[PDB]
Amino acid sequence: PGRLDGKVALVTGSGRGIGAAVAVHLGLLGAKVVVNYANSPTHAQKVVDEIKQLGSDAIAIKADVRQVPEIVRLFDEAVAHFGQLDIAVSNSGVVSFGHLKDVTEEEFDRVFSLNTRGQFFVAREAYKHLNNGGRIIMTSSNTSRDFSVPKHSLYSGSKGAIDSFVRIFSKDCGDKKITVNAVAPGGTVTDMFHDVSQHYTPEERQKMAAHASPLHRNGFPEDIARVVGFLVSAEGEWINGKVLTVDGGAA
Amino acid sequence: PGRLDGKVALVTGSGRGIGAAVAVHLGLLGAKVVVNYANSPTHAQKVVDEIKQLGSDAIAIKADVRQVPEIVRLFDEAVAHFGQLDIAVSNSGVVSFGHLKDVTEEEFDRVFSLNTRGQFFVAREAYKHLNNGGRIIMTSSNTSRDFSVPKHSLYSGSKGAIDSFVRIFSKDCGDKKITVNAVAPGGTVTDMFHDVSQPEERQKMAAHASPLHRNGFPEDIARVVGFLVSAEGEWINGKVLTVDGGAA
Amino acid sequence: LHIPGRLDGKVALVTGSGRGIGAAVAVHLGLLGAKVVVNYANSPTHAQKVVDEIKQLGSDAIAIKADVRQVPEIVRLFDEAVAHFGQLDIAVSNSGVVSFGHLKDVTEEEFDRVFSLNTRGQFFVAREAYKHLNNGGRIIMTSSNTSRDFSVPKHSLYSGSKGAIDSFVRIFSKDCGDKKITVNAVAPGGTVTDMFHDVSQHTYTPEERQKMAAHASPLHRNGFPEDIARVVGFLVSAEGEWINGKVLTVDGGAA
Amino acid sequence: PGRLDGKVALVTGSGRGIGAAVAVHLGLLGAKVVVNYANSPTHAQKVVDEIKQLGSDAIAIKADVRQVPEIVRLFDEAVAHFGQLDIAVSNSGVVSFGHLKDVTEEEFDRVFSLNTRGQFFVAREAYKHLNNGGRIIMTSSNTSRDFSVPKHSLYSGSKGAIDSFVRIFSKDCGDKKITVNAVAPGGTVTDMFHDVSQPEERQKMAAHASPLHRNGFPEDIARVVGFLVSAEGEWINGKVLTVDGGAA
Ligand SMILES: NC(=O)c1ccc[n+]([C@@H]2O[C@H](COP(=O)([O-])OP(=O)(O)OC[C@H]3O[C@@H](n4cnc5c(N)ncnc54)[C@H](OP(=O)(O)O)[C@@H]3O)[C@@H](O)[C@H]2O)c1
Ligand SMILES: NC(=O)c1ccc[n+]([C@@H]2O[C@H](COP(=O)([O-])OP(=O)(O)OC[C@H]3O[C@@H](n4cnc5c(N)ncnc54)[C@H](OP(=O)(O)O)[C@@H]3O)[C@@H](O)[C@H]2O)c1
Ligand SMILES: NC(=O)c1ccc[n+]([C@@H]2O[C@H](COP(=O)([O-])OP(=O)(O)OC[C@H]3O[C@@H](n4cnc5c(N)ncnc54)[C@H](OP(=O)(O)O)[C@@H]3O)[C@@H](O)[C@H]2O)c1
Ligand SMILES: NC(=O)c1ccc[n+]([C@@H]2O[C@H](COP(=O)([O-])OP(=O)(O)OC[C@H]3O[C@@H](n4cnc5c(N)ncnc54)[C@H](OP(=O)(O)O)[C@@H]3O)[C@@H](O)[C@H]2O)c1
């Protein structure tokens, strides 16, 4: 069930983070994987290596998805190599915490150019390059609609748009039968989660944060990776234009 | 590969409909399947058969899930037969079209007794009887909040609550490591769709609503229930996934 | 000098306007110059202060009894409401109960206790309202923030009893629309009422409990019926017409 | 009760369309009003004159809510001229239609600069200028969450972000007892509306989108804003209020 054999995926921000486990978990299902990074080539080459190890194929392309020309070159290079593209997961993203009063122009642009503006043009170049029956996944947050942490407003709205984009994308991308969904991850243990959770030591806060879920454990990249896999399968087809929140009954 | 070998599933109203693909599917993933039903024996037996056919086991147990004592006895029986239950699935439900002005008490109770009360006690009995790390799946609709379909007030509240039950049930049913979600089917092609598609060509135009320009089919949602009841779906919890296909 | 959103000429019915949000939803509608049908089941004397308090600011009220768990008493409630004032414009469904219990402990009787008033009752008040209202009327039904906005443990019956009221108002808007009637719902979130002090359990005096509950709000205070009635008194005005079909959450951006 | 005697408001882009009837409406409720325009000073004059001409004072100030340095001067000058500014309203109109395939770097930075980025910084400056116990309001669309027009992919996000902001801005601005809500207009007859109806024949059949069988007009919205910002509308904080008369 829900394998991706003879399919080729692209996953942005896949050298470290929910993205790496998305790819690896695509590769496991039989997807040939394009492992995008921008600043971590060492862990990109570890994902690519670990995707091949479990019996698939992968390349690592570097590209800054704040630059749109570098996104066209990402998707151009990606089809030039493997033959075709079916699946594109928009995952690259940054967190930002700060009361409204102190949010500067420079901070707002940093966060949106990647989390909102970037994704949009990673989605756009996904469609223009994608086989029919293809797949597009974008990354939102559960702080988008479901949880309202103070001094968190900039990051929140950066993903809210993402929630709104997918719904309309799902319409416009019918004429190639591509389905558009976001996953909205919650407290998933990554460099980004530990960086947030201050608002004691990261293990101490990871231990505590395990309680928010009634399952009484943390969320991990594998947790979210598994959901993209389903939605990016042919078996996930009828989930189209939906935002799946993946926190685990947390609050 | 998210299968359910050596696990045991129960599917209410699994004789005909979306709950007949949610049975077989859980059987194609290699679960043992208790096909529940009420006024349709032949159907549930062709289902219990098809599930045997792909190398799993199944049984037909009849029970009206409008009746809370029958739901007790259904799960009491299920566990008696396969030795344990891992996955409970609330499929059963009726449709109803009528302007607020014309809805009567009989008609209010006819719908709620099964779609809302029924599914609630199915979910009570599933918690009491289920293993740790188990799955309750309940069934709502897209007419719940998404679609404002005229003369559809009664169906919607029945399923609206189902949307609320899973969010709270997820905090409640956690003392046994059980996850709780609903699937909000759209207009999956079944006996119901046809009784309320408003001849054949009714459906032929429904296809064009979804941007994929085809209809929703029972096995299109079964697939979503299968993932949610797998080991891999465990971090989806308290959520009502909407399987509309992009319809509008 | 513009005095907006008055209800002069108009006649309104609030279910469970003896105590809680309905009293202040009836006094306030009263304050805005409307003639008001106070409804109560077991609080008759309370219901009579709320008529007097309404007559006091120079309108007119009556206190009709009816248990809205019983559908024929809903019909009689409304038949009477017109048979006194001569017409009905506004209809407010505030009557409702609370229940804490783990899914596993929730009996048939408790489900029926709650659902029969919180959902079924409200449904038929909404039905008999569309039937008895002047064209251009308003129907407000009450819900909660525990309906979707918040997931409180051992709270499952309530959330779904009031989580059907949210599905209802979006479809009722269209149905009643063939008489130009706006159907919206209010989501009382933490209103300080006998139903709040009941829940503020989940040792500590209720005051102690609400003083603390106040911290929860970014506005650091409690919700009071006064707060909710003010929204109801917009929703129903001539001017609240383009708010149609929506569930308003009136909790204070609280968590 | 419902009045604004003593209060000074601000409304961005309140020369034309809704923001203007939201400027006139607050004037009607006895607020003084900073009108704000970028391109239409002659409209910005008709408003100041109408608001003077029902008892309240008004000034018009220019500002490209795109340039953040211009947002700042606008608010500095508003406190300066009136001595306070309890209310602040956000009206940023740039509709854009197209397919994800034909959307450019340039159109995004045009819509999102005023629709998203502008509104964010109007909201920042509003906070830092406002009398404690004051108000901020933002303008989204029903096409944020409740609808899916095949082509608004960008506009919908340009407002769906606004929808998330208000929910966190309600927590932030609570340390001055300011409430922050977004009104989310449906189809509302303006210059923007006649632009993306794609004559009056395009509007006469829009009159039937709502179950009240008329169109939305600026007043319809202006009145709701008028409540949100009224003293009585306090306990609605951090919300979207979709104002579309129940339109599908
Ligand atoms: N876990 C959570 O709490 C959570 C919650 C909600 C949403 N998310 C979303 O999940 C996604 C990833 O989370 P995470 O846990 O992976 O966080 P993370 O550890 O911070 O991941 C950072 C990822 O972002 C990539 N990145 C940063 N700047 C980039 C640029 N200019 N171009 C391309 N990629 C860039 C990084 O690649 P480099 O290797 O080049 O740095 C890396 O892949 C984000 O999209 C975020 O919005 C996470
Ligand atoms: N099909 C759709 O288009 C659609 C769309 C939206 C929502 N839904 C929801 O999905 C579920 C069913 O859809 P459907 O298409 O499967 O329905 P369907 O084809 O009409 O089938 C009705 C199912 O209900 C069972 N049933 C009815 N009353 C029962 C009772 N007292 N006890 C046990 N079983 C009973 C029937 O089994 P027996 O006759 O064997 O007793 C049959 O399985 C419902 O939950 C409905 O609310 C369906
Ligand atoms: N208060 C909150 O914290 C809160 C939170 C969420 C939702 N709500 C919703 O707000 C609404 C009202 O709450 P509240 O603060 O008023 O609570 P309250 O103090 O419990 O109000 C009780 C009201 O219920 C009426 N009532 C009870 N049984 C009735 C029956 N059979 N028929 C007609 N009326 C009946 C009562 O009148 P009698 O005197 O005749 O009993 C009284 O008006 C409810 O819908 C509730 O779900 C409240
Ligand atoms: N009308 C609708 O149907 C509708 C529907 C949904 C949402 N909305 C939302 O409502 C708002 C406007 O609707 P409308 O019908 O009122 O708009 P409209 O007729 O297009 O009027 C636009 C207003 O935007 C102002 N504006 C444009 N660029 C500006 C800038 N750089 N700086 C300051 N002001 C600027 C204009 O000012 P100048 O022209 O004076 O330069 C004018 O006041 C927008 O927020 C829109 O997203 C409207």
Author numbering:
A (entry chain D): 11 to 209, 217 to 268
B (entry chain C), D (entry chain B): 11 to 208, 219 to 268
C (entry chain A): 8 to 209, 216 to 268
Text from the published report:
In this study, an anthrol reductase (CbAR) from Cercospora sp. JNU001 with the ability for asymmetric reduction of various bulky substrates was identified and characterized. It belongs to the SDR superfamily and shares the highest sequence identity of 86.6% with 17β-HSDcl from Curvularia lunata. Similar to other SDRs, the overall structure of CbAR monomer contains nine α-helices and two sets of β-sheets (β1-β7), in which continuous β-sheets and seven α-helices constitute the standard Rossmann-fold motif responsible for NADPH binding and the C-terminal domain constitutes a substrate binding pocket. In both of crystal structures of CbAR-NADP+ and CbAR-NADP+-Emodin, the catalytic triad (Ser151, Tyr165 and Lys169) is well observed.
To understand the catalytic mechanism of CbAR, crystal structures of CbAR-NADP+ and CbAR-NADP+-Emodin were then solved and refined to 3.30 Å and 1.85 Å resolutions, respectively. It shows that the crystallographic asymmetric unit contains four molecules, but CbAR was eluted as a dimer in solution. Based on structure alignment, although the root mean square difference (RMSD) of superposition for the Cα atoms of crystal structures of CbAR-NADP+ and CbAR-NADP+-Emodin is 0.25Å, the regions from residue 209 to 216 are clearly different. Upon the binding of emodin, this region of CbAR-NADP+-Emodin ternary complex is visible, which is absent in the CbAR-NADP+ complex due to low electron density, indicating that this region plays a critical role in emodin recognition and binding. Ser151 plays a role in stabilizing the substrate. Tyr165 serves as a general base for proton transfer. Lys169 can not only form the hydrogen-bond interaction with NADPH but also reduce the pKa of Tyr-OH.
